[PDB]
Design a protein around this nucleic acid. Sequence first.
RNA 1: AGAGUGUAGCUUAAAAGCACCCAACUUACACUUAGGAGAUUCAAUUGACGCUCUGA
RNA 2: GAUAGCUGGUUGUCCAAGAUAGAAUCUUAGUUCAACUUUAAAUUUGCCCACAGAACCAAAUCCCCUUGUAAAUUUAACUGU
Lengths: 133, 155, 39, 115, 120, 59
Amino acid sequence: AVAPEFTNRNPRNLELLSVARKERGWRTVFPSREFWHRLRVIRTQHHVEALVEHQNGKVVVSASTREWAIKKHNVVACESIGRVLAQRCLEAGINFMVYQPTPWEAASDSMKRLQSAMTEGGVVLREPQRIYE
Amino acid sequence: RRTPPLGPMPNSDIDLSNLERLEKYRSFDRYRRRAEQEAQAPHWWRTYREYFGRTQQLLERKQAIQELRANVEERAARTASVPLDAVRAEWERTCGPYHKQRLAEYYGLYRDLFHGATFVPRVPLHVAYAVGEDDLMPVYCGNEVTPTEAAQAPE
Amino acid sequence: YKTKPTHGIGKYKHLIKAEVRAINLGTDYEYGVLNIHLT
Amino acid sequence: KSGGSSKNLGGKSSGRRQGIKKMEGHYVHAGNIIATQRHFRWHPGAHVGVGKNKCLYALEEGIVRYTKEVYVPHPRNTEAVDLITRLPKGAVLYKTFVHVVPAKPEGTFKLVAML
Amino acid sequence: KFTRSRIPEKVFQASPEDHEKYGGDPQNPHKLHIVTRIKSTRRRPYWEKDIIKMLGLEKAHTPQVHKNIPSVNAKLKVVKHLIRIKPLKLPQGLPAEENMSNTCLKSTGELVVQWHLKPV
Amino acid sequence: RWDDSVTYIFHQLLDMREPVFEFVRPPPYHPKQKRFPHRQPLRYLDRYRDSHEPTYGIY
RNA sequence: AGAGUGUAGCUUAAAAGCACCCAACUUACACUUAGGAGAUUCAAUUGACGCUCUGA
RNA sequence: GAUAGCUGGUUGUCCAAGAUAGAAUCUUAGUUCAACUUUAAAUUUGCCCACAGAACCAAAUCCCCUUGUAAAUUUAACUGU
Ligand SMILES: [Mg+2]
Ligand SMILES: [Mg+2]
Ligand SMILES: [Mg+2]
Ligand SMILES: [Mg+2]
Ligand SMILES: [Mg+2]
Ligand SMILES: [Mg+2]
Ligand SMILES: [Mg+2]
């Protein structure tokens, strides 16, 4: 009572199984497309944004100050956005991301506190390699 | 052999002799935003997306709440509390569906379950498996629940 | 390419005027390079 | 005859053979060289590696495809950053990339045994 | 360098004057041509010789029919300066199973099915 | 995901041999074996053997 | 006083992005780090109030 | 009967296929490889192919399905250019 070959269509299956092929190219171009869940952090005037896009460009989880919710109650806002994003990615299933900021941006205190909060929430930013063979 | 261009080529409407009178990019974030906006365009030749492609009262209340929170000062900005239960309640009561629809589209629920015809969830939902009196295992949109914990009907 | 309709899609040399000495016209309605010493 | 006989020697080099090896629409395998040439001609795109001679080589079994995407190099290249900053507002480089549309999947869930 | 001579699009564009001069018409055009080589293959490039060999025109002054399609159209245009083209208009119906032994080509393209040997 | 409760259910309230999978990858390419590799190393013949063990015809 | 405009300096989504400024690197301008600021003049498109042309 | 990149010649009938990018060489009057050509055989794609695809400092060219066709790859030979 079983088919000769199984067929799964869940796009997240291969993404979490550490087998989904990445974009090995894009070496000379920045940022690199070799990832599974890129964590893009946008900093604008009066507001801050932190997205978690996909290779195809579909936003899965994100948090913004314009959410008529977190706006109530600027490193504090960045830390709050990071904590909310970590909690949402945890309760949604995401647990691995890749952050590729710029040197002048990586050497900032805001990004340092953001990474600290993300690590405290329980989310690693390394993304294990793709198992071959 | 030389053929004419079908559509307007890029960098053609700003190729004036007064290049010094222009803005001239002095940073990299602006150039990155411009490149992103350009990539987010249909284009008539090619692209990477070819083969792999009531309110007034609420606004016034929000403004008053923001003004009150700003005047309450807090002094700990120079490093604050910022609770999470209130934020979670607001998200579940306000724009919960906004993110639930995105999650469903990313997981392929509307195109697979309903075979298209996307919608927005109106009334919220809460489900949590009972591993005894406590603790309880919550079933959030996309949580990793084990078959063992799901050995009984949830609440 | 040259024959393809996408010719000159990456022409950026003309967008940069690569390379002030004694350049004071003064003929028409123009003022040469000025200097203001803040004593 | 002096000073103009054949002092301008040295010009005796053969062809280096540097061009396209797999045009668009060809079924290229993983590991075949797509093209070899000096100076970054076709920048790396999706599923396209780069060796030491600024060449290209397919990484996955698929059909080669070329497009025109925006150029945003790494901040390491100070020359590229300077050239970009030297451009006006509405300015785009639009370089020639290389893509490899994959055909076969990475694997299949086959039936092992019935226990 | 003598490259492969190409032809633009403005050449093959029948005008009302051309239609009035000849007998052809745009609406409901013919379906087959009457190819007949009237020039030798020598003194011509090698690609033209290959095209002539593919079209099957070894013996000059011999009739031949080919499909009136863009591919065959270009194949003919490639050697247009070495072949005679004429339409194959059938006054009566196409050659049926009974009209296959008594046939004739006749000049000016007129395939007759009741080919006899008697005067009118 | 997989767990022991799945096996318990299968063997209790299903009564049928549960299936097992492994996600097999496609086989290697290996182009047409040339008669004279010329510039290929000694490992060329190793890519077309079944399998390593000493196989002898008839003697 | 007849007519016109009506989200901060700019953009139509009607509460956002640019734009702006003090502190540090900057001889100096800048890229940056850390901070600051802002609109719907009112009635359930409708009439009146900042401003624009008419010896007023 | 020395050798000799060299002059000369190398015996009857008829049929068929049958013209070469270049490199090395104490080398350009000679030799090898490559390329052209011949024989027997196993394989299937060989050519003009259509949208398109192929760069910052003019005739053009490469891949190219339907379409004309029947030609092409390899194996084993070896003289000839
Ligand atoms: Mg030279
Ligand atoms: Mg002798
Ligand atoms: Mg000699
Ligand atoms: Mg002699
Ligand atoms: Mg004799
Ligand atoms: Mg002969
Ligand atoms: Mg020597």
